[PDB]
């Protein structure tokens, strides 16, 4: 019946088709038949047995020993690719993107500073004067210096801080007036049973700056609300912005602050 | 179709036929095949394209056939980012880097809008100064309360800002009060009035304010001290004017800038 | 120069000058190949669409081949011309957030910026007899008064200043109260200040503003006692008992700030 594979070769009839065949073929210029990845290129004269590559590399796959579903798959090789562009218009294309890094980088770090409380620069300042003439009637004594009761309230206060655990160094310092004897400041926050931070100061009968310092330590970046108590040392009446009988300090209206200012704290030891 | 032999084309001697079927293949030549050497016999190849390759052909075109390759546009591109994007950034960066970094720190260093930058100022007074000017109802509104002690100026580096101003002053007078007042330069009258005491005896007396600022520019601010109504007050001396513990202390004034925030 | 078949070692094979099948009108010009179609193979031109590398050397009638690859600029000229914008922003994005992320680190290391301020905060809680007397003798040396504190604070910023805060709650028979404090490694106080007792406790203090000297840790300390004569508790009454019968505060703070020049 069927001759074989390689060997014979002739001219045969594929249905209605009249094809030469053979084992392999070797026309023109070609010294010798068909080897590994060659192919029949004609040029203008005799053709040649070109072998196809990658340029630059590319992806060429060729299955060779098989003879049903054979192929040269061709592609791009990727990691040879960009490092090319980049190789040859690499100069242009970062003046291109700088031209936008200009703004693109600078709003950025900007918009960071004034969001980011972990950063942690950027700390609240807040003053708050104090003008009033105030009688304060209430007195500290050793029952309700513990309590909410000590003394006369002379303000209250909110601050926030822009920056997480961070402390307000707090100054409160009141012109206050008395008949000889002590003058006791009382820092309370909201929330607290009794004052955060008590502090001392002298009238001898005329005006003098009565003050408490301190360190305050913040929670979260909530919004906090301090309360200024201030009265006598277990006797007294102590006018606030005024002479010992309420009258103004050299007939004018004066004035007192309580200052916070937010700081981050390094560790003692 | 038809015919299959050999013939003379000009000067070459041809071969032709309707196709053709060499080594492994086991029928002729079928749609996009090509023949392809190996090892051994050729085989027929089909040429494709990979990653998405453009590889067009014209087969409907018997003369001026032809196949094409290009490219994939936004297959490649798509996977030029599938794989590598850390490399540019390690690689050309620094050149940039460094003009971008050195620039915006300086920017930082100089920008009075951005809320850092806030400057500091302290002014120590060591001289001993006796302060006969007196501090009246009179003249409390006007500039000519106290003894001048001090003068001092100081320049915002930030736009909205606040000068937290400590007046600290070392201060005796016989048993009665102190008055400490700061004046702005151009000012008819002080804008910032503070009280003290000393027994006879050396004293902290101590004004404390905070300023609005006016600008990037620099103020000149005058802290004078006196008598509060009556009487002599010594600055940085005792009660008759000879040194305290017989060494000469200082007193300061600063000015610290704060930038107030909004709720 | 001849037609036919013929013998190569063990194959059978055919060799013409030139050959043509198929729909082909003519046999293989320059840069053709045969390329079978779904009827009978065509002649083809292998082409490059977009641009691409394509190299034969038919010149060399020896390894003669066709090479293809990457034409560079038409390329990515063409990435750009389908999306010539997505990328520019995605890229920006990432070096953008390098670049922020290099700098925030430089901010918070650089101690030559301006930038980083530390602060210290050390409480006394403590009731303590000062017998140390500080006389015009013990002033310049290190032995005046009572020490009521050491305290150890480390600069973060170079070219910088502690703005010292000390204010304690002291008490002492009628007369002056004393404030002093001194560098380690220094003969004498390097900052002097006053406060007033009439019997009953109150506030005295000491500010003032010390120059930094490098990035390392310093130390200092605060000594308290009578002027001259007395006895000063500091955190107490007179007689030594807790003030309205609680335990009570003095406090000393440290807070960095970088000093303009003073006019």
Redesign the interface.
Known sequence: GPLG????????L?N??????????????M??????????????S??????????????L????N???????????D??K??Q???E???NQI?D???D??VD???Q???D???TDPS?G??K????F?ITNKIQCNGL???SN??TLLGGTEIGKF?V?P?SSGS?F?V?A?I?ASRM???V?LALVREGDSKPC????????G??????????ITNTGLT?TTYSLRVGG??SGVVWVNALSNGND????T??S?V?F?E????T??
């Open positions: 594979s390689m060997g014979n070769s002739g001219f045969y594929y209605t088709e009249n094809c030469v065949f053979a084992d392999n073929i070797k026309v023109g210029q010294t010798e038949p068909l080897k590994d990845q060659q192919i029949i290129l004609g040029t203008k005799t053709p040649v047995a070109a072998k196809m590559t990658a340029s630059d590399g590319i992806s796959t060729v299955s060779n098989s003879s049903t579903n054979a192929s040269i798959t061709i592609g791009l990727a990691e690719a960009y090319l562009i980049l040859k218009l690499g970062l291109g993107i700088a936008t890094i693109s980088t600078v950025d770090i900007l960071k500073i004034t950063l620069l950027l609240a300042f807040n003053n004067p500290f004594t050793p210096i513990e909110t926030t822009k402390m160094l100054s310092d012109i000889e004897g002590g006791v931070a008590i502090s001392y100061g002298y009238s001898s005329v005006p003098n700056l009565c003050s408490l310092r301190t360190s919004p040392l277990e300090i050299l007939g004018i004066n004035t602050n200052s200012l700081v981050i704290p390094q003692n030891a």
